[PDB]
Design an enzyme around this catalytic site. Structure first.
Site, PDB file in Angstrom:
ATOM      1  N   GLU A  35       0.843  -1.213   0.000  1.00  0.00           N
ATOM      2  CA  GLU A  35       0.000   0.000   0.000  1.00  0.00           C
ATOM      3  C   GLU A  35       0.873   1.255   0.000  1.00  0.00           C
ATOM      4  OE1 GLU A  35      -2.992   0.156  -0.635  1.00  0.00           O
ATOM      5  OE2 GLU A  35      -3.852  -1.808  -0.137  1.00  0.00           O
ATOM      6  N   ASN A  46      -7.874   8.711  -5.802  1.00  0.00           N
ATOM      7  CA  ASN A  46      -8.688   7.713  -6.535  1.00  0.00           C
ATOM      8  C   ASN A  46      -9.403   8.436  -7.678  1.00  0.00           C
ATOM      9  OD1 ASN A  46      -9.200   6.363  -3.238  1.00  0.00           O
ATOM     10  ND2 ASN A  46      -7.717   5.638  -4.751  1.00  0.00           N
ATOM     11  N   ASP A  48     -12.455   8.511  -8.386  1.00  0.00           N
ATOM     12  CA  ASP A  48     -13.782   8.970  -7.883  1.00  0.00           C
ATOM     13  C   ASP A  48     -13.617  10.227  -7.029  1.00  0.00           C
ATOM     14  OD1 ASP A  48     -12.921   7.920  -5.344  1.00  0.00           O
ATOM     15  OD2 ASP A  48     -14.608   6.591  -5.131  1.00  0.00           O
ATOM     16  N   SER A  50     -12.021  10.403  -4.078  1.00  0.00           N
ATOM     17  CA  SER A  50     -11.581  10.039  -2.708  1.00  0.00           C
ATOM     18  C   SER A  50     -10.047   9.966  -2.715  1.00  0.00           C
ATOM     19  CB  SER A  50     -12.185   8.744  -2.226  1.00  0.00           C
ATOM     20  OG  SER A  50     -11.715   7.671  -3.016  1.00  0.00           O
ATOM     21  N   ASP A  52      -6.603   8.036  -0.556  1.00  0.00           N
ATOM     22  CA  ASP A  52      -6.060   6.993   0.355  1.00  0.00           C
ATOM     23  C   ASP A  52      -4.927   7.640   1.154  1.00  0.00           C
ATOM     24  OD1 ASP A  52      -7.799   5.198  -0.875  1.00  0.00           O
ATOM     25  OD2 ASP A  52      -6.264   4.246  -2.031  1.00  0.00           O
ATOM     26  N   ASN A  59      -9.073   4.982   2.994  1.00  0.00           N
ATOM     27  CA  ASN A  59      -9.821   5.758   1.982  1.00  0.00           C
ATOM     28  C   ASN A  59     -10.775   6.721   2.687  1.00  0.00           C
ATOM     29  OD1 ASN A  59     -11.820   6.420  -0.025  1.00  0.00           O
ATOM     30  ND2 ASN A  59     -11.413   4.570  -1.198  1.00  0.00           N
ATOM     31  N   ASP A 101     -15.223  -5.088   9.263  1.00  0.00           N
ATOM     32  CA  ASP A 101     -16.401  -4.548   8.519  1.00  0.00           C
ATOM     33  C   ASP A 101     -17.120  -5.655   7.746  1.00  0.00           C
ATOM     34  OD1 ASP A 101     -18.027  -2.160   7.570  1.00  0.00           O
ATOM     35  OD2 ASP A 101     -17.235  -2.840   5.618  1.00  0.00           O
TER      36      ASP A 101
END
Ligand code: NA
Length: 129
Positions: A35, A46, A48, A50, A52, A59, A101
């Site tokens: 990562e 990202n 979209d 967003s 990280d 995110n 999650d």
């Protein structure tokens, strides 16, 4: 901060991430390697819009607030900037919520594609832990 491999393994263990939700410490070290390359200041935008953040590239869509991700949540109740600290406490606390999650470490696409199923113990081999 750019951690060494065994230095990060030790910091993750100190913060209770070793075998958290049944994921051995080498799983967490491997995910952090791919990562962020162990860099706490890592950021990635990202498609979209967003972002990280940090050693585990958490995110803004769901987990932290950066004020620039329309429609997003902040389920770790932190500014995304906290994920960039030399002190990994915020990243570890938030990663515990993410891995609880429902899809475990599959939440980290770099873990699924590069760590899952591999000899992840190699990532802590030789470390005094
Ligand atoms: Na957010």
């Amino acid at each position: 901060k750019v951690f060494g491999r065994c230095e990060l393994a030790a910091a993750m263990k100190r913060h209770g991430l070793d075998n958290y939700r049944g994921y051995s410490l080498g799983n967490w070290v491997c995910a952090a390697k791919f990562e962020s390359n162990f860099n706490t200041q890592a950021t990635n935008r990202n498609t979209d819009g967003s972002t990280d953040y940090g050693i585990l590239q958490i995110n803004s869509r769901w987990w932290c607030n950066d004020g620039r991700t329309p429609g997003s949540r902040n389920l770790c109740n932190i500014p995304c900037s906290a994920l960039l600290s030399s002190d990994i406490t915020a990243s570890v606390n938030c990663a515990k919520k993410i891995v609880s999650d429902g899809n475990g470490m599959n939440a980290w696409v770099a873990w699924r594609n590069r760590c899952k199923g591999t000899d992840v113990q190699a990532w802590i081999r030789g470390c005094r832990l």
